[PDB]
């Protein structure tokens, strides 16, 4: 709340509006925390916010899954076992046991 | 004839002389905004007008008033170029002087103290470019002019369909400029209704009560009075001898001692004549006729003081007695006629629940706000605020004007609100139409269609800003302390600033300027839209408004409109059209007095033109300009017919004025079907500029006007001689007549160099003049993209042959010789902006460092120490533009990966590779790099180098200005010193700086030398301040978004040529997609051996009736003929005589054209340069409807030495044998639209996925798969393909398990699917189950 | 009529597609109606063989 | 889920769910505080409203999401939509293994295949390429394979031709209407980014080349490959399921080729001579000895299977031309020479294909169709057909006809000023004579245009059907029709004002002449209402098929 208020006098006083470090001096605190405070303060945007074209295209339709695993990798995972399991039968029974162990 | 015309002159066919030349094509855009922001010392539209409405603002009754003084626009923060690079909006600060007055308590008014607060800043409003575009964030945007329904009253029909009883209805609608709508409408029972806005229907009379009108005055207003006298006993009556028309006699009717008519004889012209001339005022009547008649006023019994009858009640034979015995002599009744005067208003009162003013006011307030209790102050106040409040209601000037005009009033200007007189007059007029007297207007007429535009529209938004701040301003002045707070602490910026920003930023009328092409620009800035706010919608209307209207003549182009969902909802402005003074559309016309055609032009609006008889653009007059024929084709009122010699009041200005800038550029348009012409002018705007600006060989003559009027070219500010010519800049030394006395000067044009367009095309200027060449003011200095020597070249004309070629042209497909791609002529240059952002994540900040996990030196080759690609490194797909790395710690890898790192001994980094890399397949040369940095983060090495470089280049740039400027100024001092004390050889020896001392003998030359001193020192000082700001602007830390530490924007210039798949079209609506690129060997050649560039399929010609494209071909060939011919006499070096003779012959052509020509031109240097420009071809101008004719075309082909048929024999380059039949070969101007195949082409195997629904979604630009629809499903359902369909909607898209299980099988070599259940449907189960529904999958 | 006859469909999942969804689900949810699939529209929805 | 710049984004349900929770929880508190009835009652109503807003918002007041005017979307709106479910509504789910680009011709293609851009096929078969690459051991593992195609080593191209060979791809155009809107093709590798599409199919797709784009789909599972080949393959549908007539009928360029090919003039090189068979007929033509159209008897061998499933042979001297003789080389076995002995317009050339199918079966019909196209394009290219401005012949009698009809209106006009005829009667009268005039001009230029070529063979004179360029197109069935031609040479029509009341002063000019200002302006309405009507008729059609497929 204090921040909105400060931007007010300084809004017309500075003629455009105070710089990110301006209200920082106006405020008691470390003043770089302004940035940190400013992030969490934003309210989340409706994932249903209709974007462009109005075509029921909605913001949420554009949010990709980053936790997924592309198959071109999962495929190489199924392979990497077959790779390493083979090279470990190519070694002595104890080296495979010792390496599978370490 | 001008200087850039001496270089090349276009042979102009056509007869009709141009009386007026095309004005500035950007007039509308520029004039409008110019009226908005300006100091207008009166109520004319502008920031001034919107201020004076809501001002002055007083607190609530507290007698604390705040008034408004004046405003000013501060200097722009960045100029247009600077504003574009950084991303800011091009804007100026609005500084407004405010005066706060306080009345003493309690006072006869006077001020304790008044603080005049100087210019409080509210918002920065964007500014319009010299070309009429806006820059919102580093991006050019155009605001389309709007066409809406004009404010006023309008009476409509809504015939036919209503109630399916026929009968039509008649409704009036008052549409004010601001405030609620007032609607009046009838019903099948002829009861008048009213609804405010679209709200509940209400009986009309309730407003009269709300206007404080009791029933008696309602009866007294709309109806006449039938006076009844009881004289002796039982009922005499007053008679207007005319009232008996259209009705039959009710009793024995006799007066003036002579019985004129008995009972049962209808009243014709006979009966009325007798009464009028015999002056029959009073007759004796029976007591039964009033059984139906409604009493006018109230009549009470004098004795009992009790009400005998209320107003508007039907009398009976018995009722007459009770008011007769009360001593009533007079009983007033209504005049009712079912043809002339309908008993409509009367029947509405019986449906009126109200009685008095408050009742009506309550019933209105409860209509508007139902559910809430009415209040005396609420009902009274609300009604007073709707149409009677200066704040919440305005019709403005036009509303009042059209209002007054449609009501047949005298005053064209009046109150900006409604008066009791105003509403009532409309009601009277609406009834008159229902009575058969008067007619209804129609919405589609362009006299009722008003055109707004940027200046006006932005003004409305600024008003909204002031009202949403108004509520705030009163609120603070309530509690204000005496002289502590001031007219700053109250007024904020953001409320006003966010209003205007919300408009320029995302309103439907503000769009990216479709800028691949000057024609595209100029046709965007002249555009109308009936869409957006205050307009109709695609879904609402309705083919009448979409259709072309008779009033569109000379105002709106009939043929340039989109062919999509909104047809006729956009249009384009005509060529000569202008916005009327009041805001309508008026067009030029020529005043024809008596039988002579005068050259005074007269601009007539849609309604003005109505009454006049207007002649035709094509008509033959001569000598004094008498119409040759005794009768001429003309249009007078909505229709066209033959008109007499002296009838015509006016005549068309030009043969062109019906069309638009787009359509006026199509040659032989008169020969093209309207569909293909539309399509032609629609596609002509998509033509990407080419590598070599060519010129149209076949043309109209607008191309000069389009090039200059669009800012793409560089036009001379003042005339003079070119001092210096570089590919960078141009310095003109002004002629003395054009030069200002002070400062001397030279006008320096800084050319735009290679840079990105909105469509990712290349916009680059080239100098068209040579060292030391005379140029006069208004001469073309430099071509822009797609402009040649002052003309408009949207593509390159080329040799074309019509013939099926082995199916390679099958439908519209085009077969192009390799000569074209080798000549690199249709090659096009694209400039792409790629960005790399270093953000901040909860795990840590992202680094732009050149240290990237798991990459070799070949990657790092193209990178400097800092991680940014060098300028000029040509790059291809996959190359690293900007090294970027994001923190990810403690990966938690797996056993076999852990073994992998152990064996190959790589230290797996705590950092992940985010670097910006070239998209797959796009390849180009890096022409620029930008680094924006947050204020406070240390600029890395490269970023500092750049900033230092930009600084040196800036210093060099400013100094170059000063050096040439100083010489130009000192060069004037030298000449004035020579006028009275010339020492020529003596003067230029000593240092030039030591000149300012020498004075002169008494004369103005002493004050002139005096003058140049003053202006010199300012230059010394203005330069200094200019340098400093520039330096500061570089060093100032650039502002970024929240979370972004730094941004690297890389600019690639890709050069794409032509390949199968590009879309190409001529101006005639013939599309095409290049099919094969053929060797010159297989190209058809003529006997002389010259191959043909393009082979078109003739089959496209007959079906689509674009016939202009053929003439254009034929004539095109002829033009090329004169070139080859000239190319021979010049390669012969015959001499000026032989050459001059032949060129003169060409420009005449057979008789009766309008071109004129030489030999006035200096016979050697001026003539010879022109011939060099014609050897490629001789440019020809076919005016739109005045264009050339076959004979002239055929005649020009005779001079060409080329056949009249326009066809020759052609030989296949393969078999070498002839072609049976002659084939048409010629030169067609052809455009490359930007539908380029390596834009369109997309393919995806396995990409990213949407999270919410697991579905293919492009995140890397490896695009989500093609969208598979319902109709496409049916196609599979009609086929037996079950497995194709299952795999389509399960494993190929939605099955998050099955997809991976599938992929592994594809590489294993097993084509199967283990489908499972789609996640979309699997979600549907939870959504149903998330409600109270138990949905199960039964059985087994 | 064609549009009226398509209204009546045994499968409610099919009806929920092209009809008014709210009304279909409610009117079906009360009766405890059991969709046996068997039709085309529904099998496409659940993603099995037509 | 988070976004860039550290901001967050969330579904509207949270705001709704949160509310129901708060209120629910507050109510739980208000029970233990024993609040008065008036409050807990109010709290219950508020909770009731809140749950309702969660389930289906809009059956009450329509609560709006926080700080945003737009109402927050509830669970019923997640299922609901336009129309019914979004899931199954068009569109309809995005699908992997697909692509698209601008399409072009490729007449060299056989009817069962299509040109596929090199890069498109690379990115599409990416998993297959990986598997085939590691099947032969050219790549150690899938990862190395990924790097190979990403490196685009030259060696992969031969491997792609293997994985491509027998593997159909599905091609689709934008308004898929009937089942032929999707057809399976065999891939042919093409340098370049454009899709090449067999010309004969352009009719079934309604695919012009004006820049239309087509989408490609790869049939992954074995069952999908065999569905595409045995059902959706191009060659398996040559006949419309709507009506049994072939939809692969050669389109325009090809039929002008065959029309110009089998046609005959009166006197041309090779007139009257005789040849052993079509082989030496082409030998006559190709060498420049005989004209494509000249009357000639040649020995032909036709076939008739009129036995019991068995082919009879018959040889005779048929009276024909050189072109028809040459063309006979393509016609397989049991078709009679009668089918090719005619002029071969677009109408006959389809019924040719129909009969070939209904007699010899599918396989002979497919390869037949191919041959017809190849020869059609080829000979059409030889023909050197073109269109000049002098190819459109205006009747010599036009100006005279207009004047006579111009005299009639002035007759009827004199009758209206003198009251001999009523105003309404006037409008209809004038409209009829102008209409009648149009027919006159149309049927003048049609006669002149059609036969006026008047030529001589050895004897005196004679006249045949014109060889004029524009006529051949319309007669053959290639393009254009007497109606459209009438607008080029003869006067074009009487346009109609927006009102629909056809104007009593028609368009007296045509496209070969110029149209003046008024005529064009009046022409505009017909075009725009045409585009609007069609663009709307587009919408009417779609809804209709919808209602239809829903009921069936
Ligand atoms: Mg087509
Ligand atoms: Mg198309």
* Experimental technique for the deposited model: X-ray
Residues 6+ apart with CB under 8 A from D232: B1279, B1281, B1284, D168, D170, D182, D183, D184
Give the gap in angstroms from C-alpha B1339 to the nearest C-alpha of chain C.
Answer: 10
Contact partners for chain C, using 3 or more CB pairs closer than 8 A, are: B, D
3-state secondary structure B1072-1091: CEEEEEECHHHCCECCCCCE
| Inter-chain touch C47–B1277, beta carbons under 8 Å | no
Any chain B CB within 8 A of the CB of D93? yes
- Pairwise CB contact (< 8 Å): A47 & D7: no
Q: Is the dihedral of CA C30, C34, C39, C43 positive or negative?
A: positive
| Shortest Cα distance, chain D CAs vs residue B483, angstroms | 36
Residues in CB range of D29: below 8 A, 6 or more apart: none
Separation CA B923–CA B875 (nearest Å) = 6
Structural domain that includes position D496: 397-529
Length of chain D: 552
State whether residue B502 is helix, strand or coil. Answer: helix
Q: Is D58 on the interface with C (CB under 8 A)?
A: no
D108 C-alpha vs ligand 2 centroid, how far in Å?
22
Q: Sign of torsion, CA B473 B476 B482 B488? A: negative
**Does an H or E element contain B965, and which?**
helix B941-978
Say whether D212 counts as a known binding-site residue: yes
Size of interface A-D (CB pairs under 8 A): 59
Per-residue b/e over B1195-1216, b at no fewer than 16 CB within 10 Å? bbbebbebebbbbbebbbbeee
Ligand nearest to the CA of D201: 1
Question: Which residue, among B868, B930, B846, has the nearest Cα to B138 in the 3D structure?
Answer: B930
CA dist B818 and B1083 (Å) reads: 9
Ligand nearest to the CA of D206: 1
Chain B positions contacting chain A at CB under 8 Å are 74, 77, 93, 120-122, 124, 488-489, 491-494, 896-897, 899-900, 902, 935-936, 1042-1043, 1246, 1248-1254, 1257, 1259, 1296, 1299-1300, 1303-1304, 1307
In chain D, what residues touch A72 (CB-CB under 8 Å)?
A: 126-127, 142, 146
End-to-end CA distance of chain A: 57
Cα–Cα distance between A70 and B1264 in angstroms, integer? 13
Of D520, D548, A94, whose CA–CA distance to B1271 is shortest?
A: D548
CA nearest to B1286, candidates B1318, B1310, B1308: B1318
C-alpha D211 to ligand 2 mean position (Å): 6
> Which H or E element spans position B1054?
strand B1044-1056
What CA–CA distances, in Å, run from C4 to C8, C19, D548, D549, D552? 7, 11, 11, 13, 12
Distance, in Å, from the CA atom of D36 to the CA atom of B644, rounded to the nearest integer, reads 93
Distance in Å, CA B1095 to ligand 1 centroid: 20
C50 touches chain B (CB under 8 A): yes
Tell me which DSSP letter residue B838 carries. E
Rounded to whole angstroms, the Cα distance separating A6 from A12 reads: 11
Given a contact cutoff of 8 angstroms between Cβ atoms, the answer to whether B931 and B939 are in contact is yes
* Contact status of C44 with chain D (Cβ, < 8 Å): yes
The distance from CA B1091 to its chain's CA centroid, rounded to whole angstroms, is 44
CA distance B79 to chain A (A): 16
> In 3D, which of B585, B445, B580, B604 has the Cα closest to residue B528?
B585
Resolution of the entry in angstroms: 3.4
The helix or strand, by DSSP H or E, that contains position D427, with its residue range, turns out to be helix D423-451
For residue D241, the SS3 value is coil
Q: Tell which residue, B796, B821, B759, has the closest CA to residue B1060.
A: B821
Closest alpha carbon to B1221 in D312, D379, D140: D379
* C-alpha–C-alpha distance, residues D451 and D456, integer Å: 14
Largest CA distance in chain B: 138
- Whole-angstrom CA distances from B491 to A9, B470, B488, B708 are 10, 9, 5, 44
CA Rg value for chain C? 11
Sole residue written with tokens 């390669």 = B1131
Rounded to whole angstroms, the Cα distance separating B1287 from B1276 reads 12
| Cα four-point dihedral sign B906, B911, B914, B916 | negative
Do the Cβ atoms of A76 and D86 come within 8 Å?
Answer: no
Q: Which two tokens stand for residue B317?
A: 């034979």
Backbone angles phi, psi at B43, to 5 degrees: -70, 5
C49 shares contact with chain B (CB less than 8 Å): yes
Give CA–CA dist D316/D297, Å, rounded.
Answer: 10
**Residues of B numbered 778-817 whose beta carbons fall under 8 angstroms of chain D's beta carbons: which are they?**
801-813
Cβ neighbors of B338 (< 8 A, separation 6 or more) are: none
Which parts of B810-854 are beta strand (E)? 814-817, 828-841, 844-845
CB B171 within 8 A of CB B183: yes
Rounded Cα–Cα distance for residues B861 and B778 (Å): 51
Residues with Cβ–ion distance below 5 A, ligand 1: D 208
Nearest 5 degrees, angle CA D224-CA D228-CA D229? 120
In contact, D453 and D466? CB cutoff 8 Å: yes
Distance in angstroms (rounded) separating the CA atoms of residues B703 and B661: 9
For chain C, give the longest Cα–Cα distance. 31
- Classified by CATH at the fold level, domain A1-69 comes out as Arc Repressor Mutant, subunit A (1.10.10)
Of B611, B553, B603, nearest to B581 by C-alpha is B603
Q: How far is the CA of B1071 from the centre of ligand 2 (A)?
A: 9
Largest CA distance in chain D: 124
* Six-digit token string for D529: 């209402």
Distance of alpha carbon B345 from alpha carbon B296, whole angstroms: 13
End-to-end CA distance of chain B: 93
- Strand D98-104 relative to strand D195-196, pairing: parallel
Residue from D88, D90, D102 to probe the interface with B (highest B Cβ count within 10 Å): D102
What is the number of the ligand closest to the CA of D252?
Answer: 1
DSSP B584-652: -EEEEEEEEETTEEEEEEEEEETTHHHHS-B--SS--EETTTEESSSEEEEE-SSSEEEEETTT--EEE
Judge: D107–B1266 Cβ closer than 8 Å, yes or no: no
C-alpha–C-alpha distance, residues B301 and B103, integer Å? 56
The answer to whether residue D545 neighbours chain C at the CB level (below 8 Å) is: no
Phi, psi of D318 (to 5 degrees): -100, 140
Query: Which candidate from B899, B1249, B1300 shows the least CB-CB separation from A65?
Result: B1249
Q: Are B1204 and B654 contacting, i.e. CB atoms less than 8 angstroms apart?
A: no
Pick from B935, B1115, B1177: nearest CA to B1038 = B935
Using a CB-CB cut-off of 8 Å, the residues of chain C touching B1282 are: 49-50
Chains that touch D (3 or more CB pairs under 8 A): A, B, C
Distance between CA atoms of residues D527 and D525, nearest Å: 5
**Vertex D393 angle, CA D389 and D397, to 5°:** 140
Please tell me which of the candidates D7, D81, D146 has its beta carbon nearest to residue A45: D7
A65 and B1300: CB-CB below 8 Å? no
Taking CA–CA distances from D215, the nearest residue in chain B reads B1266
List of chain B residues whose C-beta atoms are within 8 Å of the C-beta of residue A59 = none
CA distance A69 to chain D (A): 15
Beta-carbon separation of B1286 and C49 below 8 A: yes
Contact C44 B1273 (CB under 8 A): yes
Neighbouring residues of B1107: CB distance < 8 A, sequence distance ≥ 6: B668, B671, B672, B673, B1101, D389, D392, D488, D511, D512
**Ligand-binding site membership of D210 (annotated):** yes
CATH code (residue D487): 1.10.132.30
The shortest C-alpha distance from B1305 to chain C (Å) reads 20
Compute the nearest-CA separation of D101 from chain B (Å).
4
């Amino acid at each position: 709340n204090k921040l909105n208020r400060i931007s007010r006098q300084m809004l017309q006083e500075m003629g455009r509006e105070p710089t990110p470090e301006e209200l920082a001096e106006r405020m008691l605190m470390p003043e770089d925390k302004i940035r940190k405070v400013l992030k969490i303060a934003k309210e989340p945007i409706s994932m249903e916010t209709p974007i462009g074209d109005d075509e029921d295209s909605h913001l949420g339709d554009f949010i990709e899954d980053t936790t997924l695993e592309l198959p071109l990798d999962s495929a190489t995972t199924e392979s990497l076992r077959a790779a390493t399991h083979d090279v470990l039968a190519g070694l002595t029974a104890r080296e495979a046991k010792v390496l599978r162990m370490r | 004839y001008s200087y850039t015309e001496k270089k090349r002159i276009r042979k102009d066919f056509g007869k009709r002389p141009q009386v007026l030349d095309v004005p500035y094509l950007l007039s509308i855009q520029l004039d409008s905004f110019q009226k908005f922001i300006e100091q207008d010392p009166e109520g004319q539209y502008g920031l001034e007008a919107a201020f004076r409405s809501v001002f002055p603002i007083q607190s609530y009754s507290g007698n604390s008033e705040l008034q408004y003084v004046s405003y000013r626009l501060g200097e722009p923060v960045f100029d247009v170029q600077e504003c574009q690079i950084r991303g800011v909006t091009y804007s100026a600060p609005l500084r407004v002087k405010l005066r706060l007055v306080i009345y003493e308590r309690e006072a006869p008014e006077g001020t304790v103290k008044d603080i005049k607060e100087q210019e409080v800043y509210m918002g920065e409003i964007p500014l319009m470019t010299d070309n009429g575009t806006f820059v919102i964030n580093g991006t050019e945007r155009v605001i389309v002019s709007q066409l809406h329904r004009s404010p006023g009253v309008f009476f409509d029909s809504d015939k036919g369909k209503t109630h399916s009883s026929g009968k039509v209805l008649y409704n009036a609608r008052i549409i004010p400029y601001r405030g609620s709508w007032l609607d009046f409408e009838f019903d099948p029972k002829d009861n008048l209704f009213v609804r405010i806005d679209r709200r509940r229907k209400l009986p009309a009379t309730i407003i009269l009560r709300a206007l404080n009108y009791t029933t008696e005055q309602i009866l007294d207003l709309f109806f006449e009075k039938v006076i009844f006298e009881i004289r002796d006993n039982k009922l005499q009556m007053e008679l207007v001898p005319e009232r008996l028309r259209g009705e039959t006699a009710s009793f024995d009717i006799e007066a003036n001692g002579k019985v004129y008519v008995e009972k049962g004889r209808r009243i014709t012209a006979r009966h009325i004549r007798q009464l009028e001339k015999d002056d029959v005022k009073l007759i004796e009547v029976p007591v039964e006729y009033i059984a139906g008649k409604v009493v006018a006023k109230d009549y009470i019994d004098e004795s009992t003081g009790e009400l005998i009858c209320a107003a508007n009640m039907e009398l009976s034979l018995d009722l007459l007695a009770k008011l007769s015995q009360s001593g009533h002599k007079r009983i007033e009744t209504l005049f009712t006629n079912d043809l002339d005067h309908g008993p409509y208003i009367s029947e509405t009162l019986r449906v009126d629940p109200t009685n008095d003013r408050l009742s009506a006011l309550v019933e209105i307030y409860r209509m508007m706000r139902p559910g809430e209790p009415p209040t005396r102050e609420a009902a009274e106040s609300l009604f007073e605020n709707l149409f009677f409040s200066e704040d919440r209601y305005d019709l403005s000037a036009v509303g009042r004007m059209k209002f007054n005009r449609s009501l047949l009033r005298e005053e064209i200007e009046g109150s900006g609100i409604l008066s009791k007189d105003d509403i009532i007059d409309v009601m009277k007029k609406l009834i008159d139409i229902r009575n058969g007297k008067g007619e209804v207007d129609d919405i589609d007429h362009l006299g009722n269609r008003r055109i707004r535009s940027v200046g006006e529209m932005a003004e409305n938004q600024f008003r909204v800003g002031l009202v949403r701040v108004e509520r705030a301003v009163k609120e603070r002045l309530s509690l204000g302390d005496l002289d502590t707070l001031m007219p700053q602490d109250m007024i904020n910026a953001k409320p006003i600033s966010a209003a205007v920003k919300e408009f320029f930023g995302s309103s439907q009328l503000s769009q990216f300027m479709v800028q691949n092409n000057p024609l595209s620009e100029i046709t965007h800035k002249r555009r109308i839209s009936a869409l957006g706010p205050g307009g109709l919608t695609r879904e609402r209307a309705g083919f009448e408004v979409r259709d072309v209207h008779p009033t569109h003549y000379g105002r709106v182009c009939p043929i340039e409109t989109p062919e999509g969902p909104n047809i006729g909802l956009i249009n384009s402005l005509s060529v000569y059209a202008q916005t009327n003074e009041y805001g309508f559309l008026e067009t030029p016309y020529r005043k024809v007095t008596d039988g002579v055609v005068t050259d005074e032009i007269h601009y007539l609006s849609a309604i003005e033109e109505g009454n006049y008889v207007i002649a035709q653009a094509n008509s033959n007059l001569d000598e004094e300009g008498h119409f040759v024929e005794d009768l001429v084709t003309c249009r007078s009122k909505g229709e066209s017919s033959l008109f007499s010699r002296d009838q015509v009041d006016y005549m068309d200005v030009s043969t062109q004025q019906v069309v638009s800038v787009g359509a006026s550029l199509i040659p032989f348009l008169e020969h093209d079907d309207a569909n293909r012409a539309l399509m032609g002018a629609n596609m002509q705007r998509q033509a990407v500029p080419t590598l070599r600006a060519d010129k149209p060989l076949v043309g109209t003559g607008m191309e000069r006007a389009v090039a200059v009027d669009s800012g793409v070219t560089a036009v001379a500010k003042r005339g003079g001689v070119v001092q210096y010519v570089d590919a960078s800049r141009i310095v003109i030394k002004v002629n003395e007549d054009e030069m200002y006395p002070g400062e001397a000067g030279i006008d320096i044009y800084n050319l735009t160099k290679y840079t990105r367009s909105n469509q990712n095309t290349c916009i680059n200027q080239m100098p068209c003049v040579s060292l030391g060449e005379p140029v006069e003011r208004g001469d073309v200095l430099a071509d822009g993209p797609s402009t040649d020597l002052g003309e408009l070249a949207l593509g390159q004309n080329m040799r074309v042959a019509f013939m099926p070629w082995n199916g390679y042209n099958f439908e519209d497909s085009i077969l192009v010789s390799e000569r074209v791609v080798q000549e690199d002529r249709f090659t096009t240059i694209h400039i792409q902006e790629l960005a790399c952002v270093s953000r901040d994540t909860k795990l840590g900040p992202e680094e732009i460092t050149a240290d990237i996990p798991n990459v070799g030196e070949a990657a790092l080759s193209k990178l400097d120490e800092s991680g940014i690609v060098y300028i000029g490194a040509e790059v291809t797909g996959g190359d690293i533009l900007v090294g970027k790395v994001t923190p990810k710690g403690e990966t938690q890898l797996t056993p076999e990966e852990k073994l992998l790192r152990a064996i190959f001994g790589e230290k797996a980094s705590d950092v992940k590779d985010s670097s910006l890399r070239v998209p797959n397949g796009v390849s180009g040369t890096v022409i620029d790099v930008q680094v924006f940095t947050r204020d406070g983060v240390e600029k890395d090495k490269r970023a500092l180098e750049i900033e230092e470089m930009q600084l040196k280049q800036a210093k060099k740039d400013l100094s170059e200005e000063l050096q040439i400027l100083e010489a130009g100024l000192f060069s004037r001092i030298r000449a004035v010193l020579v006028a009275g004390g010339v020492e020529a050889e003596k003067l230029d020896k000593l240092p030039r700086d030591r000149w300012l001392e020498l004075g002169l003998t008494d004369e103005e030359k002493q004050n002139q030398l005096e003058q140049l001193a003053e202006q010199y020192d300012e230059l010394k000082h203005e330069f200094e301040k200019k340098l400093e700001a520039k330096r500061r602007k570089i060093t100032q830390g650039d502002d970024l978004a929240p979370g972004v530490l730094k941004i690297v924007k890389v600019y690639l210039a890709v050069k794409r040529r032509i390949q199968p798949g590009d879309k190409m079209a001529g101006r005639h609506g013939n599309k095409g997609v290049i099919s094969k690129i053929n060797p010159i060997e297989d190209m058809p050649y003529d006997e002389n051996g010259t191959p043909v560039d393009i082979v078109l399929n003739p089959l496209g010609v007959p079906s689509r009736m674009n016939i202009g494209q053929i003439l254009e071909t034929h004539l095109g060939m002829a033009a090329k003929g004169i070139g080859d011919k000239i190319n021979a006499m010049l390669k012969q070096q015959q001499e000026v005589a032989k050459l001059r003779e032949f060129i003169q012959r060409a420009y005449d052509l057979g008789a009766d054209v309008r071109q004129k020509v030489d030999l006035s031109t200096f016979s050697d240097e001026e003539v010879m340069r022109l011939a060099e420009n014609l050897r490629k071809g001789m440019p020809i101008a076919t005016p739109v409807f005045d264009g050339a004719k076959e004979a002239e075309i055929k005649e020009l082909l005779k001079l060409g030495d080329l056949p009249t048929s326009g066809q020759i024999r052609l030989y296949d380059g393969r078999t070498g044998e002839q072609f049976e039949r002659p084939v048409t070969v010629g030169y067609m101007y052809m455009l490359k639209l930007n539908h380029l195949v390596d834009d369109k082409m997309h393919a995806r195997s396995t990409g990213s996925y949407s999270l919410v629904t697991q579905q293919p979604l492009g995140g890397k630009a490896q695009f989500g798969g093609q969208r598979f629809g319902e109709m496409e499903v049916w196609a599979l359902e009609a086929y037996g393909a079950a497995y194709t369909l299952q795999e389509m909607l399960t494993v190929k898209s939605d099955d998050v398990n099955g997809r991976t299980k599938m992929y592994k099988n594809i590489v294993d070599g097993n084509h199967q699917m283990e489908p499972g259940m789609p996640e979309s449907f699997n979600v549907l189960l939870k959504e149903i189950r998330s409600l109270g529904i138990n949905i199960e999958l039964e059985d087994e | 009529g064609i549009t009226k006859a398509s209204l009546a469909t045994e499968s409610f999942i099919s009806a929920a597609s092209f009809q008014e969804t709210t009304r279909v689900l409610t009117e079906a949810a009360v009766a405890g109606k059991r969709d046996e699939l068997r039709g085309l529209k529904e099998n496409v929805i659940v993603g099995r063989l037509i | 889920v988070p976004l860039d710049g550290g901001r967050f984004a969330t579904s509207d349900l949270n705001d709704l769910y949160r509310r129901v929770i708060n209120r629910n929880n507050r109510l739980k508190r208000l029970l233990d505080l024993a609040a008065p009835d008036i409050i807990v009652r109010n709290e219950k109503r508020m909770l009731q409203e809140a749950v309702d807003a969660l389930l289906d918002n809009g059956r009450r007041g329509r609560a709006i999401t926080g700080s945003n005017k737009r109402p927050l979307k509830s669970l019923a709106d997640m299922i609901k939509g336009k129309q019914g479910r979004f899931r199954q509504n068009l569109l309809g789910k995005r699908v992997d293994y697909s692509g698209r680009s601008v399409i072009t011709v490729g007449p060299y293609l056989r009817l069962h295949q299509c040109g596929l851009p090199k890069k498109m096929a690379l990115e599409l078969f990416k998993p297959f390429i990986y598997g085939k690459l590691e099947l032969r051991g050219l790549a150690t593992t899938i990862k190395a394979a990924k790097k190979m195609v990403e490196r685009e080593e030259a060696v992969v191209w031969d491997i792609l031709d293997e994985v491509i060979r027998e593997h159909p791809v599905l091609l689709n155009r934008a308004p898929t209407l009937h089942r032929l809107g999707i057809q399976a093709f065999e891939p042919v590798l093409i340098e370049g980014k454009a899709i090449q599409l067999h010309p004969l199919v352009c009719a079934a797709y309604n695919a012009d080349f004006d820049g239309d784009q087509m989408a490609v789909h790869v049939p992954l599972t074995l069952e999908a490959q065999l569905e595409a080949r045995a059902l959706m393959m191009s060659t398996n549908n040559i006949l419309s399921p709507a009506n049994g007539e072939p939809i692969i009928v050669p389109s325009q360029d090809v039929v002008l080729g065959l029309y110009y090919m089998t046609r005959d003039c009166v006197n041309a090189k090779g007139e009257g001579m005789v040849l052993t068979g079509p082989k030496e007929a082409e030998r006559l033509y190709r060498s420049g000895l005989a004209s494509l159209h000249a009357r000639v008897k040649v020995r032909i061998t036709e076939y008739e299977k009129d036995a019991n499933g068995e082919l009879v042979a018959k040889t005779s001297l048929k009276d024909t031309t050189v072109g028809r003789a040459i063309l006979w080389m393509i016609v397989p076995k049991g078709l009679p020479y009668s089918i090719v002995n005619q002029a071969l317009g677009k109408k006959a050339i389809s019924k040719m294909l129909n009969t070939c199918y209904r007699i010899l079966g599918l396989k002979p019909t497919v390869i037949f169709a191919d041959q017809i196209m190849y020869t059609g394009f080829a000979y059409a290219a030889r023909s050197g057909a073109s269109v000049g401005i002098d190819d459109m012949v205006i009747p010599e009698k036009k100006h005279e006809i207009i004047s006579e009809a111009e005299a009639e209106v002035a007759e009827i006009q004199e009758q209206f000023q003198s009251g001999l005829v009523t105003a309404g009667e006037r409008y209809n009268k004038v409209i009829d004579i102008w209409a009648a005039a149009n027919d006159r001009v149309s049927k003048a230029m049609m006669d002149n245009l059609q036969t006026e070529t008047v030529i001589n063979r050895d004897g005196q004179e004679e006249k045949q059907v014109s060889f004029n360029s524009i006529y051949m197109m319309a007669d053959s069935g290639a393009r254009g029709s007497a109606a459209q031609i009438r607008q080029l040479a003869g006067m074009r029509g009487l346009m109609a004002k927006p009102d629909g009341s056809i104007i009593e002063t028609p368009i007296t000019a045509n496209f070969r002449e110029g149209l003046n200002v008024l005529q064009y302006f009046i022409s505009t309405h017909g075009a725009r209402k045409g585009l609007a009507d069609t663009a709307l008729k587009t919408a009417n059609s779609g809804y209709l098929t919808r209602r239809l497929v829903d009921v069936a």
